[PDB]
């Protein structure tokens, strides 16, 4: 994130003298590559989390290109106060909404308990695909099964891979965060 | 062709095709390897090469 | 010491915890050996060599020094597991005090537990206890990322809630932040944490341990942290753990008796390329009689066929592949069919190919098969997880597809293995995946020809069901006739009764191995190049024979052929383990070609061609 | 899960069943396709949403009423008083359970397990000569001729020596039979026989039983996570006799199924959600009609019946019964069937009782022979003259697997006479009997 | 490297580039393509010439008669009855369109 907004702010400094309209610095995603060997998805043990990871896949399916959001403003309910620009976190990570209404001012009553409704226009979201990578077909072993990993893609890693279509990809190994079967502890990677 | 190569005595007769899938067609060539003993052992000293 | 208390919350006092964590310590340290080495020392010499994280025991050698600990084990197994852990981190790191980056933890496994248990019988009287058991892996899920000592978030003023530890049981839960004082909708910091690998199979009592009217009976198992992919589907494995009840497994819902689940957490799953390799294949490859040794290698529980023993020698080893630019797909597999009359043993060939060649699977044109020949994709049962199963070709990509009865293959298994044995990939098209796996495959098949007797007057394309174009591309095919003779007879019958009697269950050429490393060996790092063969005289060869073949109905030796040939001599070069082909191997490859021709050719011409050809059938 | 024995359905009655709980030390006794007397209480599980219609429930009798904003009324209601359904099920609660039909009042082991009266029954049974006919004549005593079919029968039901070589390969033992012959041959006459005969001898018919039961299912534990792997025809059968009738009329699907058993001696299902590989040992009698529905002599078997050459090379002995029209013969066969329907009771003259030949197949299973060097002699010598025989012609070629099948019948014969070892006897017959089995193909 | 053929080696570079289409002032269409068959023996390498030419075009898909391993030949659409969208298995002749 702080590479992001370096990028954002060279951007803008580059391209300064801007016409009407394109003035708002507009979000400068920063995809990745390197040159090393890519290491094979059975190589993914836990010791190997929320580090930088390049591996050899082929893609089975995408799923569609659809909504998640980046910034979201909620308004209370009574006093219809608004809470704008909640910074949504990245990846597959929710978000508990605020519990009681911060104005100390709602009237000589308080505003109720969980006030808060998400304001849908005022989000702005991005692009966001749930790729379903396999272990590529020469990598698997000879008895076993092919292994596989959930991808999670962004703004401008959305749809530039369809099905089939065998990749070397970089990114970061991660577990589900939507609030905390023989096993406990286990959320879905 | 059917009968395995390209006997003389079935000619006009050694295709299964239809004519009107013939007739979409822009060039249709016949490859026979019948009596050439100078372009054979050539051919296996290509595919050797 | 023993009192009127159990021996769980025995070893839950204080006074006896420091007791039996000296023992271990002690017996540890001093615990020499059989014949006086101090085993503990080079063991956990390795253990930090490697870092294995793991360190493994033998009961009989803990019950025979230090007998109470072993009485307490399988009692309350988990208590003194923890101490143990405990004990073994204080020795590694009075060892190599360098080791406290290195995980900050050891387990300790124990083996040779005496009390085997049996599937069958595993009561409410093993429950948290450490049992041993026997079975075979059924399905074994991929590694999952476990929480171990976890720290939250508390997402309403981001402290850090500090590391918590996760044990099995019940998922840890925070009650409120030391800071705010919320008990908040807290969530895990994904970076902090630091997780533990987790594996889920499922074992179950072997077939041939199951008794005359039975199903066999599954238990689960939970492997962490270090015994994670220690075993895949089908391993027959011993298995050691606590037998385990109490996490959150009840039929506590409605509609159930008030029935619980089980697990194992498994505490030690034990299983039931190289050097000098170089100096052993070459020191034999000297002998240079090693063509007819591995000849004679191949295939020791079959009888005759020995035509078929040196074919599929040659398929095993390949040729080389070659693209001259990148326009030219020429190949180093050698394709095998076996045509012939039953009960010929063409199966028992297949699946001694089976057996030997690494990357091996086996496949039937009925719907019988293990591994099918098409790709397609779904939802694997045993997984639910939404596979690419890709085809038994690209199954094996770099050695064998194994095709029995190849004759009845659907039409669909028609067209797959055509197209892969022509472009030698397949292009699977199905859901969204449209991709082109590349199949290498060296296919050997087997086919019983029309009406379950070869036929000599007809031809072995049209006695044979397969198509023009699949027969065609086979390098080898090969004739199977079960010719009624008493020599012949007298030897099959006395070597079948003679195995029979021998495989009674009262008395319970080179090792195949030993043939598997020099078939790796031949066919990786040995490529023997071809300047050094009459080309002239090859040449010359295809001349007489097409030559010759000129007629009516009689189908000639082609290019194919040559190819094959070729294919075939830089075989015999690898099988000699040469570096460079030699007349020798060229004359061999000549030899089986022209035999794997005129046998296919019909019995008249065959005679023909056999009269006029045999001072290269001679050598 | 058991239910309602075949003898007491009443009319037009699908056969019941109930749940039976087994508790400690009661609990692996029973087994699948056993035929158990279980005793114990009947009670009553509670049971709820088991219907769309409201039934009998229970609630509190005190009299409490609700306040307003609260008051007890709906979801609320419900919940403080504490509604809920009382709808149960019988599930019967096994204290005990034994077999119906016991085959004992408790080799080695079954020896001491025999009371003093069934050994010395047993003993004198092997002592016995001419036990073979005496066997064939208990076993049928409703037939006439068809001896061949009655000493293939015998020797299936004893079986052959399974073997397993040290590479792997799982030699079979069990020895299939199949019937083959013109319509009203008492074909499925024999297989009903082998049925209310035999323990562990399933039957079943034709297109009357689709794979998934034929072989094996699956289903979810109601209680648990687990899966139960429900029994086939297959699995009832395991180490036993299935009894396929209309054996050529199988779909294709299902008789590449029974084709893998009999390769294999096992079926591994992965299906819905569960993985196992079931051990099915079982052998297999079948009855199958020739095309056109009667045996033509002037074609090969082959070509008369329509099964899969590999299955018909599995299939270890062939019996031709052509419905020729031999008058001597057509009077034997009327007076016997009338005498047996005038004197149903009597007229049946088994000189050994069916339990007493039951537990004789059950303690003769155990023994294993071997064979002797000159057993192994006589084998492949008369083998060698079974192909000179084949070098006219018969109407299904002679192959290894026929002498396979003969060293599996002579191992059969020894099991027959419990003998440790097979003997030029047991060899000169299982030829002979395999011999007349082979018929020349009759050309005009 | 194929021996000879020179015909067929002159017809396959002719084939590669193919015409120009023709849609017309009325609004009917005209192939830019070539089509070549190539009927005749085993032993030349008619299919050895079909994969180089798959290799070589920019885009192209060598198949054979009876659709595909694990693909058809023509294109088929299928409507699905749970989600209602008309899936597009897309055969050779459409995965190589332009090709
Ligand atoms: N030459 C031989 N050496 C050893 N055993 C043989 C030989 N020929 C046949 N057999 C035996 O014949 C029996 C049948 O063998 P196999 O499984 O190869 O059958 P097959 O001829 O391939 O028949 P099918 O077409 O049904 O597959 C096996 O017991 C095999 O041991
Ligand atoms: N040799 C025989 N001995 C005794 N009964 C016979 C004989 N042949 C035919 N039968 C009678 O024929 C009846 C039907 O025979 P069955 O085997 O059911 O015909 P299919 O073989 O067509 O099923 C039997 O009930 C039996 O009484
Ligand atoms: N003129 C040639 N030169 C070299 N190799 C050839 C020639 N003709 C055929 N071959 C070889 O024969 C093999 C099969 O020929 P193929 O391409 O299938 O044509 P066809 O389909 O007519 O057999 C090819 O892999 C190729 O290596
Ligand atoms: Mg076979
Ligand atoms: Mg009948
Ligand atoms: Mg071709
Ligand atoms: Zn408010
Ligand atoms: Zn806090």
Redesign the interface.
């Known amino acids: 994130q702080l590479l992001e907004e370096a990028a954002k702010e060279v951007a803008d400094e580059v391209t300064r003298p801007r016409p009407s309209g394109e003035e708002v610095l507009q979000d400068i995603q920063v995809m990745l590559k390197s040159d090393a060997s890519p290491s094979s998805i ?1 190589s ?3 010791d190997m ?2 580090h930088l990871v390049k591996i050899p896949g ?5 799923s569609a290109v659809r909504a998640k959001a980046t910034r979201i403003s909620i308004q209370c309910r009574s006093c219809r106060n608004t809470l704008t620009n909640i910074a949504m976190r990245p990846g597959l990570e929710g ?2 909404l605020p519990r009681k209404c911060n104005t100390d001012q709602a009237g000589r009553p308080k505003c109720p308990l969980d006030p808060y409704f998400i304001m849908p226009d005022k989000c702005k979201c991005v692009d966001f695909q749930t790729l ?1 990578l ?1 272990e590529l ?2 990598a698997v072993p ?7 990993m959930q991808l999670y893609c962004d703004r401008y890693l959305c749809d530039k891979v ?5 990749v070397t990809i970089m990114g970061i190994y ?2 589900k ?1 939507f ?2 079967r ?6 879905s ?1 | 062709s059917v009968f ?2 390209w ?1 003389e005595t079935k000619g006009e007769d050694n295709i299964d095709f239809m004519p009107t899938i013939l007739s979409r067609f822009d060039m249709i060539f016949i490859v026979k ?3 050439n ?1 100078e372009r ?6 290509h ?2 090469t | 010491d023993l009192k009127g208390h159990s021996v769980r919350e025995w070893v839950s006092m204080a006074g006896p915890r420091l007791e039996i964590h000296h023992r271990f310590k002690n017996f540890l340290r001093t615990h020499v050996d059989s014949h006086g080495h101090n085993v503990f020392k080079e063991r956990i010499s390795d253990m930090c060599k490697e870092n294995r994280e793991s360190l493994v025991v033998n009961y009989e050698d803990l019950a025979a020094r230090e007998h109470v600990l072993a009485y307490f084990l399988p009692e309350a197994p988990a208590e003194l597991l923890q101490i143990f852990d405990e004990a073994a981190l204080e020795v590694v790191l009075a060892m190599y005090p360098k080791y406290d980056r290195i995980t900050n933890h050891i387990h300790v496994r124990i083996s040779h537990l005496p009390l085997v248990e049996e599937l ?2 595993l ?2 009287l093993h429950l948290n206890q450490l049992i041993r058991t026997s079975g ?1 892996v ?2 074994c899920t ?7 000592m ?1 720290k ?1 978030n508390c ?1 309403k003023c981001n402290f850090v809630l500090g590391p918590f530890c ?1 044990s ?6 925070p009650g409120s932040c030391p800071e705010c004082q919320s008990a908040g ?4 910091n ?2 902090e944490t ?5 594996q ?1 199979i499922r074992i ?1 009592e072997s ?1 041939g341990k ?1 008794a ?5 009976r ?1 238990k ?1 198992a ?1 492997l962490l ?1 270090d015994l ?2 220690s075993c ?3 391993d027959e494995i011993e298995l050691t753990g606590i037998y385990h009840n109490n ?3 009840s ?1 506590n819902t ?4 008030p ?1 619980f ?1 089980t ?1 194992i957490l498994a505490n030690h799953v034990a299983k039931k390329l190289t050097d000098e390799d170089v100096k052993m294949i070459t020191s034999l490859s000297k002998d240079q009689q090693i063509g007819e040794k591995i000849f004679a290698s191949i295939a020791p ?1 079959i009888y005759g066929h020995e035509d078929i023993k040196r074919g599929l020698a040659l398929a095993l080893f390949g040729g080389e592949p070659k693209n ?6 020429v190949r180093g597999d050698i394709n095998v069919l076996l045509c012939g009359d ?3 043993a063409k199966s028992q060939f297949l ?1 001694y190919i089976e ?1 030997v060649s ?2 091996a699977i086996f496949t039937t044109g ?3 098969s293990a591994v099918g020949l ?4 779904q939802r ?9 199963e ?2 038994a070709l ?2 094996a ?1 770099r050695g064998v597809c194994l095709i029995d ?1 190849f004759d009845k293959m659907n ?1 669909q298994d ?3 293995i ?3 044995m ?2 030698q990939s ?10 082109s ?2 199949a290498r495959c060296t296919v050997i098949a087997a086919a ?1 020809p029309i009406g ?2 070869y036929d000599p007057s007809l031809t072995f394309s049209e006695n044979v069901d397969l198509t ?1 174009p699949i027969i ?1 591309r086979f390098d080898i095919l090969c004739v199977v006739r ?1 010719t ?1 003779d ?1 020599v012949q ?2 030897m ?3 070597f ?6 021998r ?4 008395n319970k050429p080179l090792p195949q191995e030993v043939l598997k490393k020099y078939i790796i060996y031949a066919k990786e790092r040995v490529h023997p190049k ?1 300047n050094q063969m009459d ?1 002239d005289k ?6 007489d024979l ?2 010759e073949s ?1 007629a ?2 009689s ?2 030796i ?3 052929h ?2 094959s040939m ?1 294919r075939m001599a830089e075989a015999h070069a690898r099988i000699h383990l040469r570096d460079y082909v030699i007349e020798d191997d060229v004359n061999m490859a000549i030899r089986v070609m022209l035999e794997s021709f005129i046998d296919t050719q019909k019995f008249s011409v065959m005679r023909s061609m056999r009269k006029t050809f045999a001072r290269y059938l001679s050598f | 899960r058991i239910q309602e024995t075949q003898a007491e359905l009443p009319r037009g009655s699908i056969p019941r069943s109930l749940e039976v ?1 087994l508790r ?1 030390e009661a ?2 006794s029973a ?4 035929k158990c007397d279980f005793t114990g209480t009947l009670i009553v ?1 509670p ?3 088991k219907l769309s219609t409201p039934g009998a429930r229970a609630e509190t009798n005190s009299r409490v009423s609700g306040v307003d904003g609260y008051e007890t009324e709906g979801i609320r209601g419900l919940r403080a008083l504490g509604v809920r359904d009382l709808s149960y099920r019988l599930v019967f609660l096994a204290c005990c359970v034994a077999p119906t039909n016991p085959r004992f009042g408790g080799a080695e082991s079954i020896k001491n397990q025999m009371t003093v009266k069934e050994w010395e029954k047993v003993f004198e049974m092997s002592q016995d000569k001419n036990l073979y006919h005496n066997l064939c004549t208990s076993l049928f005593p409703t037939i006439h001729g068809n001896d061949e079919v009655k000493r293939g029968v015998l020797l299936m039901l004893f079986g052959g ?1 399974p ?5 792997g ?1 799982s ?1 079979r033992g069990d020895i299939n039979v199949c019937i083959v012959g013109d319509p009203s041959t008492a074909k499925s006459q024999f297989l009903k026989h082998v049925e209310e005969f035999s323990p ?1 001898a399933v039957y079943t018919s034709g297109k009357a039983s689709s794979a998934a039961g034929l072989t094996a299912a699956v289903v979810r534990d ?5 899966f ?2 429900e ?1 086939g025809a297959l ?2 059968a ?2 036993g006799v299935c009894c396929i009738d209309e054996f050529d009329k199988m779909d ?2 299902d008789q ?2 029974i ?2 058993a009999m390769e294999q001696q ?1 079926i591994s299902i ?10 099915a040992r079982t052998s297999i009698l079948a009855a199958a009609n020739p095309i056109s529905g009667h045996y033509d002599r002037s074609k090969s078997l ?1 070509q008369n019946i329509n099964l899969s ?2 299955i018909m ?1 599995r299939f270890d002995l062939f019996f031709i019964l052509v419905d020729e029209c031999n008058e001597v013969t057509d009077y034997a066969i009327a007076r016997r069937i009338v005498d047996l329907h005038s004197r149903i009771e009597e007229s049946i003259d088994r000189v050994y009782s069916l339990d007493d030949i039951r537990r004789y197949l059950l303690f003769a299973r155990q023994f ?1 022979p ?2 002797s060097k000159e057993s ?1 002699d006589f ?3 008369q ?2 003259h079974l ?2 025989r ?2 006219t012609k018969s109407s299904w ?1 002679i ?3 026929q ?2 099948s003969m ?1 599996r019948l002579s191992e059969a014969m020894a099991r027959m006479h419990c003998c440790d070892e097979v003997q030029p006897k047991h060899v000169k017959e299982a030829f002979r009997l395999l011999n007349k089995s082979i018929i020349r193909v009759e050309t005009p | ?1 194929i021996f000879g053929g020179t015909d067929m080696k002159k017809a396959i570079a002719c084939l590669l580039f193919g015409g120009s289409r023709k849609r017309l002032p009325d609004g009917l269409t005209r192939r830019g393509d070539i089509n070549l068959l190539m009927l005749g ?5 008619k ?2 010439l079909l ?2 030419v798959e ?2 075009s920019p885009i192209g ?4 008669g ?7 030949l023509t294109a088929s659409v299928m409507r699905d009855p749970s989600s209602r969208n008309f899936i597009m ?3 050779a002749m459409v ?1 190589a369109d332009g090709g």
Not at chain 4, 270 to 279: P, Q, R
């Open positions: 059975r993914l043990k836990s989390m929320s082929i893609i089975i399916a995408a978000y508990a379903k396999q077909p020469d000879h008895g076993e099964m092919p292994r596989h369809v099905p089939g279509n065998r991660s577990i965060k609030g905390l023989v096993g406990v502890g286990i959320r990677s | 395995g190569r006997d390897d019948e009596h003993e054979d052992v050539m051919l296996a000293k595919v050797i | 069958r019988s009561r409410q075979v059924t399905s991929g590694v999952l990322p476990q929480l171990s976890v939250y997402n996760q099995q049981n019940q998922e840890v839960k909708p807290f969530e895990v994904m970076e630091i997780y533990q690998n987790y889920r179950q077939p199951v005359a009217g039975r199903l066999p599954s689960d939970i942290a994670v992919d895949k589907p089908g996490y959150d497994g039929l409605a509609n159930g008796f029935v689940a697990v529980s001259p630019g990148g326009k030219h797909k039953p009960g010929t699946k057996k690494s990357r009925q719907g019988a098409t790709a397609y994709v694997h049962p045993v997984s639910r997880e939404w596979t690419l890709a085809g690209v199954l990509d009865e039409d028609r067209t797959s055509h197209e892969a022509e472009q397949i292009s699977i098209s199905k859901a969204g995946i449209v991709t796996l590349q019983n379950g007797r023009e065609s079960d009624v008493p007879d007298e099959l019958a006395r079948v009764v003679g195995s029979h009697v495989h009674h269950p009262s071809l080309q090859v040449a010359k060869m295809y001349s097409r030559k000129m009516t109905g189908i000639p082609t290019v194919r040559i190819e070729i | 709980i400690a609990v692996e087994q699948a396709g056993d599980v049971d709820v949403s020596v073997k397993t070589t040290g590479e390969t030699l562990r109601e209680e648990s996570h687990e139960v792997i029994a699995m009832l395991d180490n294709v699907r590449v199924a084709h893998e096992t992965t299906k819905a959600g569960v993985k196992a590989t079931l051990n082959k050459a590999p090379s294993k071997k064979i192994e084998i492949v010598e083998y060698k192909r000179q084949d070098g070629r192959t290894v697997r002498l396979e060293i | 490297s023996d085993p032993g030349t390498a299919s050895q994969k180089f290799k070589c898909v060598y198949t054979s009876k659709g595909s391993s694990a693909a058809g298995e897309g055969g995965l």
